[PDB]
Amino acid sequence: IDPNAQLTTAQLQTYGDLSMMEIYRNYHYAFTQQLMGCWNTTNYGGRHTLDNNEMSRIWTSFYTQSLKNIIDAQYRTAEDAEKVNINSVLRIYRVYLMSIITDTYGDAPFSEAGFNPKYDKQEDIYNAFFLELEDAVNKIDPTKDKVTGDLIYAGDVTKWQQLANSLRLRFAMRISSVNPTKAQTEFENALAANGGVITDASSDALIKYMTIAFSFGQEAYSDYRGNSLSQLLFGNDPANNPSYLCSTFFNQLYNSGDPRTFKISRCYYDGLMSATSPDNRVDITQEMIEKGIAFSPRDPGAYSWEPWPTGYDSDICAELAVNNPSVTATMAREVEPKLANNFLKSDNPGVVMTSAEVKFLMAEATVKKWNVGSVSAEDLYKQGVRAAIDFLTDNYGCTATTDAEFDAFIQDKGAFGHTDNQKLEAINTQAWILHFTNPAECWANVRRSGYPKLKSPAEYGFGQYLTGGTEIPVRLCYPVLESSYNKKSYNEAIERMGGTDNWHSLLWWDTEN
Ligand SMILES: OC[C@H]1O[C@@H](O[C@H]2[C@H](O)[C@@H](O)[C@H](O[C@H]3[C@H](O)[C@@H](O)[C@H](O[C@H]4[C@H](O)[C@@H](O)[C@H](O[C@H]5[C@H](O)[C@@H](O)[C@H](O)O[C@@H]5CO)O[C@@H]4CO)O[C@@H]3CO)O[C@@H]2CO)[C@H](O)[C@@H](O)[C@@H]1O
Ligand SMILES: [Mg+2]
Numbered sequence: 001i002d003p004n005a006q007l008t009t010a011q012l013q014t015y016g017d018l019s020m021m022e023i024y025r026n027y028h029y030a031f032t033q034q035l036m037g038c039w040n041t042t043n044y045g046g047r048h049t050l051d052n053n054e055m056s057r058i059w060t061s062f063y064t065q066s067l068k069n070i071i072d073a074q075y076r077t078a079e080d081a082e083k084v085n086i087n088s089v090l091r092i093y094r095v096y097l098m099s100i101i102t103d104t105y106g107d108a109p110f111s112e113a114g115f116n117p118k119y120d121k122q123e124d125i126y127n128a129f130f131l132e133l134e135d136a137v138n139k140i141d142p143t144k145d146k147v148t149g150d151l152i153y154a155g156d157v158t159k160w161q162q163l164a165n166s167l168r169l170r171f172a173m174r175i176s177s178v179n180p181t182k183a184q185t186e187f188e189n190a191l192a193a194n195g196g197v198i199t200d201a202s203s204d205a206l207i208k209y210m211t212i213a214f215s216f217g218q219e220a221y222s223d224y225r226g227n228s229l230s231q232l233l234f235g236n237d238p239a240n241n242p243s244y245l246c247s248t249f250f251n252q253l254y255n256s257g258d259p260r261t262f263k264i265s266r267c268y269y270d271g272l273m274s275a276t277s278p279d280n281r282v283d284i285t286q287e288m289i290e291k292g293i294a295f296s297p298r299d300p301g302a303y304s305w306e307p308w309p310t311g312y313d314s315d316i317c318a319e320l321a322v323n324n325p326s327v328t329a330t331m332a333r334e335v336e337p338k339l340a341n342n343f344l345k346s347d348n349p350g351v352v353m354t355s356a357e358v359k360f361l362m363a364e365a366t367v368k369k370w371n372v373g374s375v376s377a378e379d380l381y382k383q384g385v386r387a388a389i390d391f392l393t394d395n396y397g398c399t400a401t402t403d404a405e406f407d408a409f410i411q412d413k414g415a416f417g418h419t420d421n422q423k424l425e426a427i428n429t430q431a432w433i434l435h436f437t438n439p440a441e442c443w444a445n446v447r448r449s450g451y452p453k454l455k456s457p458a459e460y461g462f463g464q465y466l467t468g469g470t471e472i473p474v475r476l477c478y479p480v481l482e483s484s485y486n487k488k489s490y491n492e493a494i495e496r497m498g499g500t501d502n503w504h505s506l507l508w509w510d511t512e513n
Contacts, residue, residue: 003073003086008149009224010066010093011207015350016224018216020061021232023476026054028439030246030300031472032432032446033454037244037298037336038235046301046457050468050503056479058104062097063113070094071114085145085157088136092164095129096352099171102126103444104476106507107493109486116486119493122508129171130186133164137193151208152352161195163205166353169197169361170441174448176368177511184370187361191372198355201387201394207350214276214346226346229439234278234344239270243339244304248454249436250297250337252429256413259389259405260433263398265337267295269317271327278344284314284334296335300455301462304333311335342396343437349395351438356391359384360431364449367423378416381427385414388434425451447474447510473503474510 015021022040029035030045043049062068070090077087101108102125109117110125120128140157153159168190176183191197198204212226216236233243245265253261262285269282288295296309311332318329363380365372386406392398414430417423428451435442446454457463458470478501482490497505506513 003077004149006069006073010070011151012224013066014207015227015229017061018221018228020057021229023057024439025232028443032442033246033248033300034436035243036246036300037304039241042303047465048468052480055476059479067097068114083145084139084141086147088139089147089160091132091136095132100440105478116489119489126175133168137161137164152205158195159203162198162203165190165193166198166358173361174509178509187365188371198358201355204354205352209346212346227348230344230348233339245297245337247297247299257409259401259409263392264340266340267334268338269334278341287316293335295337297337299460301457301460309335342398356384356387356434359387360427363427367420381416385430450512469504471504475503475507477501477503
């Protein structure tokens with residue numbers, strides 16, 4: 001009933017729902033070519049398997065829970081002067097959750113959602129995002145009702161203005177190909193709105209999750225207290241099918257001399273690792289470097305087992321073997337980079353939006369000749385990269401990158417370009433690294449900006465397996481069951497796309513493939 005508790009639940013579900021996070025490991029992480037090799041990632045997204053049920057998870061999870069609850073809470077709270085803050089916060093978080101739906105699937109229920117709700121055109125949903133965030137920002141008033149269930153900003157309603165105006169930046173940059181004039185105007189208005197935007201890391205929008213032991217039992221699916229994305233990236237089958245990194249991502253980090261290379265990824269021997277927890281793994285990364293062993297990250301479409309890499313004999317593992325000889329010294333699949341333990345904790349925050357992103361958005365707007373302030377595009381980009389690197393230090397307990405290590409990176413392969421194209425590539429490639437823990441935003445921004453320039457699994461010699469088509473999908477399909485619950489509205493949506501629900505159909509804001 002209570003709208004403040006409704007907000008809590010909505011925030012927890014965003015990364016707490018173990019059912020929903022399957023979609024990100026199956027599809028998003030493969031489409032963005034950040035992870036590859038894990039059976040689920042490779043089979044589904046890596047090889048373009050059309051599976052309606054796997055594609056439906058965001059739609060179902062939100063319309064039956066968070067978004068339904070929030071819409072209700074907003075409606076009960078709407079026209080109350082004495083409840084104007086909780087109202088405005090709900091409106092802002094409603095917009096965010098809706099942004100995930102429309103960015104996955106195209107046209108969708110918004111205005112009439114919460115008996116046979118229309119599928120609002122994506123254009124008009126985005127129209128509503130700006131209007132909603134602008135009104136919410138203007139209604140916030142810290143003298144009125146206080147917010148009690150807020151796991152992002154603990155009720156700091158000033159920081160909600162910063163988030164709202166920051167989301168305005170994000171959505172304005174999103175529509176900057178389809179509708180440049182509106183994009184510019186909405187971006188410049190957002191900078192001038194009450195509260196401003198997120199100018200530094202202390203106003204980062206992060207959902208606070210607790211430490212609960214990972215469980216894949218039935219009771220676990222109703223428990224959103226933990227970060228279930230991190231739970232899943234550890235794995236239901238963690239020894240055989242862990243989060244192996246994709247070569248596009250690992251090679252970007254490694255070949256650019258990126259300081260985060262061995263903060264995001266390690267090579268681990270997992271023979272002695274427990275199920276349930278990433279404890280007792282054996283880090284062989286430094287050993288591999290010292291001995292000159294090639295890393296073998298997984299090309300798009302590849303499993304961990306094919307191609308089966310040349311390895312080496314680990315002296316560390318040979319040491320372990322004398323005391324308990326069920327350990328192999330001979331490494332094979334372990335030379336394949338995996339996601340570092342820092343990113344496999346239920347502690348991990350739920351990333352909504354960061355100061356690092358705002359910097360990249362500011363840099364891009366500057367490159368596009370918008371009127372955004374007096375700071376240079378290059379400086380904005382540099383601040384963005386610094387913030388994205390420090391994001392790991394502050395939130396995932398990674399090692400600090402020294403001023404010297406940063407300066408060496410930024411003056412060489414991390415450098416802002418000179419050409420507009422080069423600058424856009426740099427900003428958006430770097431933003432792609434930042435968004436690793438925000439898959440929803442990572443896939444949207446990859447599709448929108450066109451960077452990094454990803455190649456289809458077909459180009460890596462896996463065309464023979466690309467069951468659902470050759471090109472990397474650019475959306476996910478509506479759940480089949482919408483055909484019977486919401487037929488008229490469902491059929492109208494599909495008539496706009498050409499009469500088929502195709503996952504190669506470009507979303508309205510996506511102009512190029
Ligand atoms: O065969 C070649 C290759 O296989 C590898 O092993 C694979 C195997 O082939 C796959 O079939 C197997 O697939 C499992 C998925 O990994 C796993 O994610 C999924 O988990 C299910 C769970 O079992 C199910 O109960 C759960 O139901 C919940 C619903 O999702 C919720 O909506 C509902 O509210 O609550 C229920 C719970 O009551 O859903 C999850 C998914 O969300 O199960 C799949 C089928 O078993 O994966 C194997 C690897 O893990 C092998 O490793 C290779 O070596 C080999 O060459
Ligand atoms: Mg595109």
